[PDB]
Design a protein around this ligand. Structure first.
Ligand SMILES: CCCCCCCCCCCCCCCCCC(=O)OC[C@H](COP(=O)(O)OCCN)OC(=O)CCCCCCCCCCCCCCCCC
Ligand SMILES: CCCCCCCCCCCCCCCCCC(=O)OC[C@H](COP(=O)(O)OCCN)OC(=O)CCCCCCCCCCCCCCCCC
Ligand SMILES: CCCCCCCCCCCCCCCCCC(=O)OC[C@H](COP(=O)(O)OCCN)OC(=O)CCCCCCCCCCCCCCCCC
Ligand SMILES: CCCCCCCCCCCCCCCCCC(=O)OC[C@H](COP(=O)(O)OCCN)OC(=O)CCCCCCCCCCCCCCCCC
Ligand SMILES: CCCCCCCCCCCCCCCCCC(=O)OC[C@H](COP(=O)(O)OCCN)OC(=O)CCCCCCCCCCCCCCCCC
Ligand SMILES: CCCCCCCCCCCCCCCCCC(=O)OC[C@H](COP(=O)(O)OCCN)OC(=O)CCCCCCCCCCCCCCCCC
Ligand SMILES: CCCCCCCCCCCCCCCCCCCC
Ligand SMILES: CCCCCCCCCCCCCCCCCCCC
Ligand SMILES: CCCCCCCCCCCCCCCCCCCC
Ligand SMILES: CCCCCCCCCCCCCCCCCCCC
Ligand SMILES: CCCCCCCCCCCCCCCCCCCC
Lengths: 480, 309, 100, 101, 162
């Protein structure tokens, strides 16, 4: 369909991020300046947030056969933009330690944010596929940005090969779904069925291959083995972006796909997703038990937390507040992961070159970085689902949503995985305060410290008083 | 066994075979004309007999299939690209809906002759020279299609007969002049014609990829290059100079006159222009001709949309 | 007159062969080749499905698929060249340093 | 299924067959008769060719339907070509397309 | 258009089967080019004329050229993989072949049992694809330009020599 000016108003964050990509690229073409290009990128992302306010002042409508903009899309756009802004802020000191070109980083972060926004508004299989690829390829660049280092090149090769394979799986599944149902829009996948014929074998096989691709992207068992290697090998701001923005955007488009598709309330797909959620929770928590590397530990943590989110997704076509639970949990998980990966990024910045080691060495962090240790232990308590943290509010939402839908196996899985998480998260948070024998001064490092401190304060305050976040998420509802 | 359908299909097949044979013989005669201007038919027959009866020696440390396959590509790619060219009303081989896209298909396949000759000729210098030549041909194939896309935009279709019919009033050399010059440059550079002759001459660490090709494979490369310039000239005529359209002469006479004029102009610009440096050629391509094709497409679209009430 | 089942089965056969080539081959170049086979097979499946319905959306999905194929082939070959110039070895089992 | 289209299909098939067979017969006669007795800039330019060839395919699709898309399609293709040209300007200015540094 | 579809599908299957089990990279890329030309013929048999044209122009004319470029510049002359041929050993290929055969069996069983009126094979022109591309699929085109820009920037950053 044609694009009216109101439709152009509803595309405002997408347009502003694309224009920021063009402007930053032309500025690099003018002169290779780190500060100006980083500033232009963060100005473009903040302008995209203000454009989200302007989009909210407009209506909720279908801008294309491809895109649909509503409060759901606005919430996920805001989450992706916050994650991208935090990634740029954490990236500046680390890139200040870098030696090669250091503005293509911000260009790639902007293009990945553009893909996240497209997935936030995606109402079509074409827009879903394109948003996944626009997330993925800049992350191929960003994970191997320090390709002279062995670990970053290894993580880049693994992520590139496995994401190309997963995109092939997703595209073949989309092709089988389109072979069954003549339309590629979300609301028409399974529409031409009735009288108990919703489980068409070709439609289920197509959704299975799409589940393979998306479950690679979400680090769900058994498509999870890439996660600790890529999280450990990637640069720490890249690990921050990969943990927050990619997972949030892909899970949002999966939420909308299962909300809108008439095949979403299928018993077979629900049982398969229940198996995947159970295995993801238990396996991620069990594999994170004996990890001394903080980044591998957060990779397995991401596996288990996406399992909890999947549990909230399974109850979507039965209950009502599954969308609200996913929103609250995703806000809490975003802020906790931003704090944890930002502490990891700040202590690993500036970049020490490809030859020097990059181990975190979090033991006894309090005796020389007390504020970062306090932020890190708040984040470790939040990822554990401890009360007085927003992670507990998300976990409580997941438990309430599971109890309402009689998903008792998943409820018991959440309880057991939470106990295992208690063990390893408390191990990290108490190793922060022990005594270690042995083993800045610019405002961008201070900006990263302020970002992790504000994330910690948000986690604590919204864990004590979660009503504002619930009220914000509840008014961000999609088209029914 | 007499039916007008069988007569029609047999006559169309005969026309296609006649077109093919005339193109091959014209490529051989243009090879003779370049070798003389810088009997003759008897001399070309003698050359063909000599290349036939000389032993074909494939190198011992060379891959036989790739070495044999490179001259086949160099001949057949643009010789098959000729099949869309309408030489006269009712004298076209294939009236394809894709047309100029089929030409682009054949040129993209044609780069493999250079790549395969360089790899199979087991020599590092020949490999480096082939890498430079293939980089040059990619650098001009990048905008060959857009230089055609201006004319496609004016015609509204990819079919060549539709382009010829849309040039009924004014030939496309006048509105699509920048498309014309960019297509001329790209067609010369794809076929490795002067001034894009020897990109390996800028370094003593490189050699030509035609070295180690003896006898009939060298003859295939030679006649394939001249057939390539013949079909480039015919495409130039049908895309920018009305095809077969003229006031007084029969249509084939007009098409043959324009194609012969363009073949002679390719000979003249070989004899006249000097070859620039390799980096100059690559920079000129990527920095001048690709943006010119993009801007020409934009301006053509704006003019078309304005002139439609 | 050509069944949809036959075109989809052809695409499935090519996809499975590309996945097998991706798994069994230890050279990274052949892994990239298998990836290209898989993405081309999925694009062929989209073209078959679009031709069955008489819609242009199948060829549009093909165009997006080959845009992805071109860009990720570029990225994968750049990473292959980096691995070759840093290790002089394209064995994918040698680049296995990070482990659980 | 008309006579003209099947005639042109047969003519095109005979053209391809006789052409490839003529090349094959030329090589067969040549072989049978007669007695007996690197640098990363190439990757960069090839990758640039691939990327700009895909963007060229988008413009190929646009160019055949300019009148049917109207001025809105012109604006969209102008944004496409602007992004394409900004990428080209970036490649030229960073020295990616500079062959002699 | 039926015989062409079946013979081109057969050629594509045989060519990619030869691709995945070959040792010479240039031979494997040549067989891959043959499979791509066969798939383009399959596209032309179904009436997707633009898709077949782009299969030869882009897939068999740009991407495989990049692969041939990389193979020629890395100069694979049997660097400790050709002299081993570990993929031809039964213990390396037999397992994944069984797994892929099971996946193919499940997928093909899903394909069968689906209603099929048959593919008409009527030509869907490039004009209709262009109308759809710059009509209801505009943002796909713009963000695909952004996708190709991302690939360009990543490949330049990783693959430059210095
Ligand atoms: C404090 C509690 C915790 C907060 C955490 C937030 C995390 C996510 C951030 C983005 C969330 C955006 C959610 C927006 C949902 C809006 C849903 C909706 O329908 O809004 C409509 C409303 C206008 O009302 P109405 O009359 O309905 O409009 C229709 C009239 N045609 O229009 C609106 O409501 C407009 C909404 C505009 C939002 C602008 C946001 C700007 C960015 C703020 C960042 C703050 C710093 C956070 C990070 C700290 C450091 C890490
Ligand atoms: C490791 C620790 C975690 C263990 C796993 C999590 C708990 C598992 C609980 C299993 C419950 C099995 C229920 C089986 C029947 C389900 C279907 C049914 O008919 O349910 C009855 C009823 C809903 O039917 P309705 O007609 O609406 O009746 C309303 C009035 N009850 O249902 C209801 O009204 C609600 C039923 C609630 C069931 C109990 C939930 C609380 C569980 C308490 C703790 C776990 C059990 C005790 C400890 C075990 C060892 C750890
Ligand atoms: C009476 C039956 C009915 C009532 C059931 C009530 C269930 C809930 C209350 C009971 C929970 C029992 C938990 C027992 C384990 C407590 C944790 C523990 O002992 O941790 C210490 C230990 C670390 O110490 P160490 O072994 O020295 O170090 C090894 C690593 N270097 O840590 C480790 O070695 C690893 C610890 C891993 C994480 C803890 C284990 C979690 C297991 C699942 C918890 C839920 C159990 C549900 C019920 C099961 C049956 C009773
Ligand atoms: C050593 C040998 C290697 C292999 C060489 C080639 C093998 C095949 C040779 C035999 C070909 C037999 C004839 C094929 C069919 C010809 C007619 C045809 O294609 O018709 C279909 C279609 C018609 O379209 P149209 O006329 O516009 O509309 C009619 C309405 N339905 O028209 C189209 O769809 C036209 C587009 C398809 C044209 C394909 C032409 C050949 C392409 C491959 C060239 C290979 C070059 C050499 C090797 C390169 C490196 C490997
Ligand atoms: C519009 C058509 C633009 C085509 C540009 C083609 C190109 O690559 O031009 C290269 C040109 C010169 O670049 P270069 O030779 O590297 O500069 C050395 C001078 N000290 O590069 C230039 O002249 C710079 C490009 C100028 C225009 C784009 C940047 C500004 C855009 C502002 C908004 C309009
Ligand atoms: C023969 C046994 C095998 C010998 C070795 C291999 C040789 C090549 C075999 C495959 C290619 C030729 C297949 C036969 C095609 C004959 C022409 C034909 O079937 O035309 C029908 C149709 C015409 O179009 P349409 O208008 O729709 O027709 C209905 C009429 N109203 O046509 C169409 O719709 C499209 C026709 C096909 C597409 C064009 C040709 C594609 C060529 C692909 C070559 C692949 C590489 C081959 C390499 C060989 C060596 C290994
Ligand atoms: C309610 C918030 C809970 C999480 C934050 C915990 C950190 C609070 C601020 C830091 C205080 C650290 C005190 C460490 C004392 C160690 C003494 C060791 C020798 C006895
Ligand atoms: C290795 C970790 C394993 C954790 C397993 C956790 C299991 C928790 C208990 C689940 C009990 C579910 C009971 C469901 C009964 C449903 C009856 C329905 C009747 C209509
Ligand atoms: C360099 C030119 C190559 C041309 C190749 C095709 C030649 C086709 C010859 C066709 C001749 C008859 C055309 C129809 C009749 C009109 C002309 C009558 C007087 C010759
Ligand atoms: C029919 C005549 C119309 C004249 C006015 C045309 C201009 C108004 C409509 C413009 C629509 C342009 C849409 C462009 C979308 C670009 C999205 C880029 C995302 C990165
Ligand atoms: C060093 C480890 C190398 C592992 C190569 C991949 C092995 C995959 C085996 C899969 C077998 C599946 C058999 C059917 C069940």
């Amino acid at each position: 369909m044609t694009i009216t000016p109101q439709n152009l108003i509803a595309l405002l964050p997408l347009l502003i991020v694309g224009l920021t990509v063009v402007v930053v690229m032309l500025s690099i073409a003018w002169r290779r300046n780190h500060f100006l290009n980083a500033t232009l990128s963060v100005i473009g992302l903040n302008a995209a947030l203000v454009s989200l306010w302007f989009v909210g002042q407009a209506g909720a409508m279908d801008v294309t056969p491809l895109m649909r903009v509503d409060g759901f899309a606005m919430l996920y756009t805001g989450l992706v933009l916050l994650a991208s802004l935090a990634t740029c802020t954490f990236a500046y000191p680390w890139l200040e330690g870098y030696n090669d070109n250091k503005d293509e980083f911000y260009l790639l972060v902007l293009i990945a944010a553009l893909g996240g926004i497209l997935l936030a508004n995606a109402n079509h299989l074409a827009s879903l596929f394109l948003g996944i690829e626009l997330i993925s390829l800049p992350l191929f660049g960003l994970v191997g940005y320090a390709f002279r280092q062995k670990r970053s090149l290894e993580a880049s090769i693994k992520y590139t090969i496995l994401s190309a394979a997963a995109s092939s799986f997703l595209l073949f599944g989309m092709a089988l779904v389109y072979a069954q149902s003549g339309d590629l829009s979300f609301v028409a996948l399974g529409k031409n069925l009735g009288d108990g014929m919703l489980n068409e074998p070709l439609l289920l096989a197509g959704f299975g291959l799409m589940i393979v691709g998306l479950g690679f992207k979400l680090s769900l068992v058994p498509f999870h083995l890439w996660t600790p290697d890529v999280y450990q090998g990637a640069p720490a701001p890249v690990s921050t972006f990969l943990a927050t923005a990619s997972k949030i955007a892909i899970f949002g488009v999966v939420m909308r796909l299962f909300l809108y598709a008439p095949v979403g309330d299928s018993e077979a797909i629900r049982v398969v997703l229940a198996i995947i959620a159970f295995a993801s929770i238990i396996f991620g928590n069990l594999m994170a038990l004996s990890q001394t590397n903080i980044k591998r530990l957060l990779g397995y943590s991401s596996i288990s937390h996406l399992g909890y989110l999947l549990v909230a997704l399974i109850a979507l076509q039965t209950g009502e507040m599954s969308m609200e639970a996913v929103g609250v949990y995703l806000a809490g998980y975003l802020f906790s992961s931003l704090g944890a990966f930002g502490v990891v990024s700040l202590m690993s910045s500036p970049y020490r070159g490809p030859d020097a080691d990059s181990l975190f060495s979090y033991r006894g962090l309090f005796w020389h970085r007390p504020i970062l240790a306090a932020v890190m232990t708040v984040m470790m308590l939040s990822l554990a689902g401890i009360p007085m943290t927003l992670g507990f509010i998300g976990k409580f939402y997941v438990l309430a949503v599971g109890v309402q839908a009689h998903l008792w196996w998943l409820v018991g899985a959440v309880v057991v995985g939470s106990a295992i998480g208690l063990y390893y998260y408390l191990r990290v948070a108490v190793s922060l305060y022990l005594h270690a024998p042995e083993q800045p001064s610019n405002w961008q490092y201070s900006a990263g410290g302020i970002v992790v401190l504000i994330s910690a304060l948000l986690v604590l305050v919204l864990g004590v008083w979660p009503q504002p976040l619930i009220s914000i998420v509840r008014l961000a509802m999609p088209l029914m | 066994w007499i039916s007008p359908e069988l007569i029609e299909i047999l006559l169309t097949i005969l026309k296609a075979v006649v077109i093919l044979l005339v193109v091959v013989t014209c490529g051989a005669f243009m090879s003779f004309g370049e070798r003389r201007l810088l009997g003759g038919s008897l001399q070309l027959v003698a050359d063909m007999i000599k290349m036939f009866f000389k032993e074909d020696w494939i190198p011992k440390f060379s891959d036989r299939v790739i070495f044999t396959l490179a001259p086949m590509i160099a001949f057949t790619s643009l010789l098959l690209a000729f099949a869309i060219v309408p030489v006269s009303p009712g004298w076209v081989v294939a009236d394809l809906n894709i047309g100029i896209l089929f030409f682009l298909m054949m040129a993209g396949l044609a780069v493999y002759a250079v790549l395969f000759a360089g790899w199979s000729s087991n020599n590092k210098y020949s490999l480096l020279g082939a890498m430079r030549a293939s980089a040059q041909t990619l650098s001009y194939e990048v905008f060959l299609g857009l230089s055609l896309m201006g004319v496609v935009a004016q015609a509204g279709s990819f079919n060549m007969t539709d382009i010829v019919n849309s040039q009924a009033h004014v030939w496309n050399v006048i509105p699509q002049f920048f498309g014309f010059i960019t297509f001329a440059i790209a067609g010369v550079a794809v076929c490795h014609r002067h001034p894009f002759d020897q990109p390996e001459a800028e370094q003593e660490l490189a050699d030509g990829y035609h070295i180690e090709y003896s006898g009939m494979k060298f003859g295939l490369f030679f006649v394939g290059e001249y057939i390539g310039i013949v079909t480039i000239s015919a495409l130039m005529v049908t895309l920018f100079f009305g095809g077969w359209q003229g006031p007084l002469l029969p249509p084939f006479i007009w098409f043959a006159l324009k194609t012969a004029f363009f073949m002679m102009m390719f000979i003249l610009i070989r004899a006249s222009l000097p070859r620039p440096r390799y980096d100059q050629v690559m920079s000129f391509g990527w920095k001048i001709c690709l943006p010119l094709t993009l801007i020409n497409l934009l301006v053509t679209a704006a003019v078309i949309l304005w002139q439609a009430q | 007159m050509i069944p949809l089942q036959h075109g989809l089965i052809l695409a499935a056969i090519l996809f499975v062969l590309g996945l097998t080539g991706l798994v069994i081959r230890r050279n990274l170049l052949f892994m990239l080749i298998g990836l290209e086979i898989m993405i081309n097979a999925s694009a062929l499946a989209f073209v078959v499905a679009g031709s069955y319905w008489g819609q242009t959306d199948g060829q549009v999905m093909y165009i997006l698929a080959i845009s992805l194929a071109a860009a990720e082939a570029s990225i994968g070959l750049a990473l292959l060249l980096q691995l070759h110039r840093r290790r002089q070895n394209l064995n994918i089992d040698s680049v296995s340093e990070m482990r659980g | 299924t008309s006579t003209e289209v099947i005639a042109h299909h047969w003519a095109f098939a005979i053209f391809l067959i006789v052409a490839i067979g003529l090349c094959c017969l030329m090589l067969v006669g040549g072989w049978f008769l007669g007695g007996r007795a690197l640098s990363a800039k190439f990757y960069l330019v090839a990758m640039f060719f691939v990327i700009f060839d895909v963007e060229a395919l988008y413009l190929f699709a646009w160019s055949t339907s300019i009148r049917e898309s109207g001025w809105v399609g012109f604006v969209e293709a102008a944004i496409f070509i602007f992004v394409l040209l900004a990428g080209l300007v970036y490649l030229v200015r960073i020295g990616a397309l500079d062959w002699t540094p | 258009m039926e015989f062409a579809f079946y013979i081109c599908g057969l050629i594509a299957i045989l060519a990619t089967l030869r691709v995945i089990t070959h040792t010479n990279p240039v031979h494997a890329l040549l067989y891959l080019i043959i499979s791509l030309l066969a798939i383009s013929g399959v596209f032309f048999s179904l009436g997707a004329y633009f898709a077949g044209a782009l299969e030869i122009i882009v897939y068999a004319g740009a991407i495989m050229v990049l692969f041939v470029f990389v193979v020629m510049m890395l100069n694979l002359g049997g660097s400790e993989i050709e002299q081993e041929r570990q993929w031809l050993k039964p213990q390396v290929w037999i397992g994944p072949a069984i797994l892929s055969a099971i996946m193919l069996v499940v997928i093909v069983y899903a394909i069968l049992g689906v209603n099929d009126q048959g593919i008409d094979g009527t030509p869907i022109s490039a004009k209709a694809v262009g109308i759809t591309l710059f009509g209801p699929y505009v943002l796909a085109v713009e963000l695909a330009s952004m996708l190709l820009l991302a690939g360009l920037v990543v490949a330049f950053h990783v693959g430059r020599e210095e």
